[model samples]
Target chain A: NITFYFPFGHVPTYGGDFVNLEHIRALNKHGFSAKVILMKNQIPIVIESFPKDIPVVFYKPGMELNAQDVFVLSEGVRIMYSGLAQTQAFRVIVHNQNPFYTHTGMDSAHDINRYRITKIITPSHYTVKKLEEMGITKPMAVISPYIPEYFKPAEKSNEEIRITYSRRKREEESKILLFYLRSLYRGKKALHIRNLTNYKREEVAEEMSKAHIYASFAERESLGLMALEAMASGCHVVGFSGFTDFENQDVFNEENGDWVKEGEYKKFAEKLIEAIEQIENNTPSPKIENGLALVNSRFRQDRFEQEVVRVYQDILDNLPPLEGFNESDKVVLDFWHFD
Target chain B: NITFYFPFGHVPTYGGDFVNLEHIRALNKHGFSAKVILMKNQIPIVIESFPKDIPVVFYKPGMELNAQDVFVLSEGVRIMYSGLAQTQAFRVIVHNQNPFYTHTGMDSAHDINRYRITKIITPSHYTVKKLEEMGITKPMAVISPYIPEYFKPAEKSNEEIRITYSRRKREEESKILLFYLRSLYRGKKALHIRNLTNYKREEVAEEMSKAHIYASFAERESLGLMALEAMASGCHVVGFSGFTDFENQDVFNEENGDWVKEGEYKKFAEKLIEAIEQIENNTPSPKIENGLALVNSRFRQDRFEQEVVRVYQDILDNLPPLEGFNESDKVVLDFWHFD
Candidate 1:
């Protein structure tokens, strides 16, 4: 079965990684194998530059197809760009786990196949509930995305606490939130990172591993995978509570980690203090274990890959009959993005 | 109490004294007086020939508003010609019963005032049900409109009948349905009174009333008040059923009218014959009384005035209190379209 991950751009924001790199890796490890087809020049440079031992196909732009085994779209824009090729696919799977889809209602597209796609897949149960409210009764699969396996939980330590913050090119508001939280927790040795302006992937990984806390204050997120990566890297994570995908409070513990609700900026500062103190104390308690377990079970590479493949196979097995393509039929491919 | 009636532009088809003069007379009778408000004029005669007794308020060509009462707004080159005075008045009664409001889902303007509207007044319950389905939950009152009370009913002495078909102005498939229905009723003295590229309103209504039978076909309608007016003027009405304001078997009867079902438009010729025979031989007992009663109860001059007064009072009650009147707000006894 052919499975495609769509995106128009691949910018790094904390939680967007859940649907990007981590999702692909997880699907690859699972038994159900599928191809990752990207658009011309739209794939992320890092992923494109990385060594590829798997089947990753990039379709030539403007190639049209009268038929396809299956087509996958990420957001409404991808569905629009897919044009007529999308209708020819035997099945179209939509994975619009972004906040944009939540605000923009379905039916904006004239064609039903564009928005009311069959086999709708959402990364988290939160998205599934939202789709249900829109009366999208299509068959759906809800799977929480997995984190990369390269990172692991931290052992109890008494090392001096270090914290790192990240804000994307446009996250000026979040930058303010991050600074406000940091000022409250500032001490003789606090490390307050801003504008992350630029950093090598390896440099980021090394810093995250040593950092005691990784924080952000973005107002909206899709089950932020960065905080997961920090938790996996053994950093006591803290971020804006109601704004992030970490809204699943189970991901963070009251005694060990922090989540700041939007209006409660002051409370966010206080929460950061408590989480840093608990992590600084280096206590081996059930709260830390529970937080770590939540990440380990859901973020493990093997778990994520299995879910992605299972989704691909289930869609293929139940796909509608396809019309054979003539030599003159054009072939097309759709792409999605992570924000 | 005062009532307000705004009938966009007096167009030809079925509207005659009912929406035009009689509605004003009715409003005056019930202790509730009213004036008619027409949308910006596309026809010069409609503007200049405005009846003296019923004052016509014209917005400046481009301004379309009095600065004291309205504001000018533009978004890029897309200039929205908003009438500010109407907007201010809307805050009072909330009922902008213009047919444009019926397409509430298609745009945002009507939705903004949907909450403020106390009730929607439609000509028929058919329109009420249609708007309700589209989320217009404001209370709906169905008052089937009027025709000239002086027009004569069908003649028993005439052996054969002249067929006159009038349909609303539309450019799409509906126009095709109109021509199709016309061909079926051919061979008799038939006239297809279509809206000229730029036709006069009185011309069309005058032509429609001259015929013995009127034909209207639409997939949806707000009571199709025109057809009712024609039927009340003594013509046998033949139309597409279940696709209009009249509930099943309520307004349509073998004697007074025939609403075609089962064969869609193809049944037009046969239904016309059935109604003609029933009217001629008296084979079917038509609820001529019921039809007349419908016109009377729904379009009585007294009810029109009373309802209009209630509408004005309701709007006046809710208007924000004005601390003081500016020079422009001075009470001017000049002519106005509505009180």
Candidate 2:
């Protein structure tokens, strides 16, 4: 049995917390006995954050893994520093999603040795590069995270100059810029400017699916996830690169989105206005076509699972002698398991 | 006599277009015969956009600007390029509020001679410096613009953690960041995140009077006017500097606001949350006291008018020959007067 340790926060939003649950189910489909060990579980009331079919177990007494169990841990200092999942399992995998968070729990990357991690996994080459820079020499694998299938684009646009952007990282900017655009523009076709802050995640995708443009304000992102969801849902993307997306050529490029330098709000606003003008005057842009194509081909669920399965299968097949398995230490592992 | 050319547009918002009308009233208060020559006038309906006390006249036949008159024009290619006020009055002053637009109508700053200009007037030393860099050797004067008496601070706090911000310029960002902040926070005090778009200017100040903080998302601004107004209204100000306010130390600084490096929205949002925590925990900040003190001392109406009178009186007294005065050009001057 393989168990992915899932930490629970009462906080809101994202696939970020649910990635482990997703991996558990994905592994199960490939004949692996996989489940999520939800630590510090909030019972059924707090369970609404995850998918219902995701086989889950709250860390409890009388649970012990044999030599077959493999444990997966996430990349947060809060998770690691708390010693939530101190394990003497047959094997362990470290999933480092963000390079910036690598030192949060430990003094250095070399200090990852304390976990006795057999392999490291990450979401992108961007994080891998940073991990390498920080002196992490463990064998690493990359599995591009997948958006749920429901985030698909609309079959046909309503043929409006509609624009939607998030009001998260750049909320202050949004406070000034959108209303400035609202003040600037007046024409036969009025702009339909929508912001993505107040809505639930389901509604965000539903809104993006219908929109013609996504004014991406990605800030210091690892994989540019939400904006990728925008493109995957058939929206033409524009705005700041925020640096990381520049490294992931398959996800973002000059041909797919109108890129602006990180802090140039004036130029970014102009591009937004200019982009609205572009859609108003023309047919479905080739950029949108290319965007959806890239996503469908490379970022699909089956592809994500296929890649994830191969990594796990290969890692499991080529094993050095497994170490540190102790039935007597099961109670400590169980305590750390669902924390 | 003076005629400040005001261009009429069907679109919405601000002191930007109304500056001429305000200048006319200011000059008139100083015993100067001044009126806004509202070119291409839209009758009484569009008249609502300007203040009622602002005396105005539309360009019509049989009216001519006399030799005693001065003409003031704005800094826009649309205004200057159209030659709306190709004046042959006693003198003309180019009130260049924005330095970037100085060469918009003309090929270079020297080509400002095409208008037979006398002197240049601007709102800040910042614009004066920019104008000088662009080879504008014309004698320049700085008359800081003043917010209205209505924007004064509230008498006593209701003691809520209220926040207000403009939903202009950075509107797209507001969509994402605000909703994201909404998701992040769930504390004892619910955030009163009131957006300052879609409200009339009157309603804006009314809202600001009751708020505790102003999330300033200033973008490529000249004088950071709205944020200044927020400070003048006694709200704790926070957010991006937008590069321009760095010049106006009186209006903004580390002591006055938790200044984030421009466009660093992540850090900006963190400061916003931290600022809220500070207010929720402590007494009113000394920063708000100093901010109001700065505005009351330096940017008040009487101070503004006094400075305007000084610049105009000195320039009027120290004149070279007033060579462009012409009676024969009366028809063209009258034709261009309000249009």
Candidate 3:
């Protein structure tokens, strides 16, 4: 039985969760038994099937809950690193640059490695550099998360300059950038700025698909997951990134997408204006196809599962036997299963 | 101690029910005791001090319980329309519409008025005509519903041909007209057509505000409450006169809104296009102020309440002296301190 690991605090609202339902289904199709050991709930929830068909075993003795255990059965780097650290049967944890709780000051990596996770994965080189900066020597199995195949480049809409943003609150400081964009592009009737702050997921996806370009104004993002998701949903992404932007080679200087200088929102707005004019008038320098394909191929669920199995086999072949694990290790999984 | 009552099924989602929280807080400001009688649970349970200063009571006493009894005084046309049939105490049932539920072709109005109700209050002449249409000659008082004074005209954004088709989804014919409108105006990116369904209240309002002109497509509406609300929210209204559509006198030629032939959505869309283009290009024919003042004078909640109070006093004043209920009839409120 293959154990699937994730380090989510609790059942995420589906936006930020790495291994979502689609990935779970993909993993199930790959003939691997799945267990979700969560950092939030600290329970082992197994997958006999998808969400409706899963069977849950709350607590079973001899199930070693740790980060490496996740790596043993999963390829998600974050899950391998943090989840293998006694992170429950199927759970894994990734370092959140601003974890809602108090920061452990970069001390979580070694704490995560206690489980001797077989493989580490990183979606972006930024994350790789961060791990390397923290002294991690384990070579990462760099796997980009999946983007769907149907997402064609949304032709620039004749509608107003569709500026979409996702944030914690609607009336927060993030709206300032939207306001600036509206002011700058007032003549283009550039005032149609829609801030999708915690909107219904499917609804937001529909809106994003109709957008001309979606933007992120945050000067720093550990990883802009939603920004990429927006692009997959057919919106051109215009975000801020500097020396510390930590983008993969996909976000190359001028070949893929627009990444303006950090903190200059107005200047960024101007760059977006130039981008919009370019997109509207059909002028291009960026090689966006490679970036789009990178997401569709590497970050997808099938790839995720294949890589997961690859990590599990590697660990079984090379790493020492799990400390106290027996062939009859009780595969613990629970909570999500309804009796 | 005043027990403010909110008769609703869902809390804090959206619609007329969601507005109760704001109204409750407004009541609290006047030092009145208030609590929300929530029918459905959408939000998670939080500390009572959450939303800081508003103490909301989330209670589900079976699906359709008479929650209005939880208050000392509850007033509005909603008491009856909200599906509450009977109550004692100072509780009153203000009939918003003319009891159109009883307006079947062969059914006598007397059979419908046999409901065990406390008091009936009408809101408009539009509603009165519905009563007359149902063969009721009884003199009913009128009151206008409240509109916040702070509500200002939102500046029209996007020159897209904004057409508001307010149709009733009562029968197959009504459904066909709506489908027809959808087909005729489907691909015009410049045409922002809004279909105002009664069930999706606030959403319809949001879409209506974005639109420039309104058209009524209901078969048997008493007063076109939604059309009035839309006009109040500031859209030039087009009326359908089959079942009393343009009673507010807001629909004229191109100067005001238009009244088109039934099932002629093409004609409807054309007139709507005419109004919108007139509004867009600053054509001087449409008198927007006349429409605004008419909506303000007729649909105001204060006018609705005055009619409500007058109905109750009239019922009490013209009462035949009974053997029991004298002036000493204990004035216990219905929803809160029930008999």
Question: Against the true structure, whose TM-score is highest?
Answer: 2
For model 1, the interface Cα RMSD in angstroms equals 22.0
- Number of the candidate with higher DockQ, 2 or 3: 2
Candidate 3: segments with Cα more than 4 A from true spot: A1-9, A14-23, A37-50, A53-55, A60-115, A149-156, A168-173, A186-190, A218-223, A242-252, A279-297, A324-326, A329-339, B1-339
* Tens-place lDDT digits, model 3, residues B1-339: 225455444324432333345445555554455665543442555323236655655543332322223332122233333343333332333334323433211124443345333444454555565454444444555443455443325666655656666545333334433333433332334556665665365566666666666666644444445555556657777645434244332323344346664434446545555565576676623445665676677556455445434544455555333223333344322332211
* Per-model DockQ: 0.01, 0.03, 0.01
Better of 1 and 2 by lDDT: 2
Docking class of 3: incorrect
- A227-334, model 2: which lDDT tens digit per residue? 788888888888866563365334578787887764444566677777777777775568888888878888879999998899888778865564465432443444
* Model 1: fraction of the reference interface contacts it also forms: 0.00
In CAPRI terms, where does candidate 2 land? incorrect
Window of ten residues with lowest summed lDDT in model 3 chain B: B65-74
**Candidate 1, which segments miss by more than 4 Å at Cα?**
A1-33, A42-50, A54-68, A79-82, A85-87, A101-116, A153-159, A169-197, A242-256, A279-286, A323-339, B1-339
Find the candidate with the highest lDDT and give its number: 2
Error of 1 at B218 (Å): 45
Best by DockQ: 2
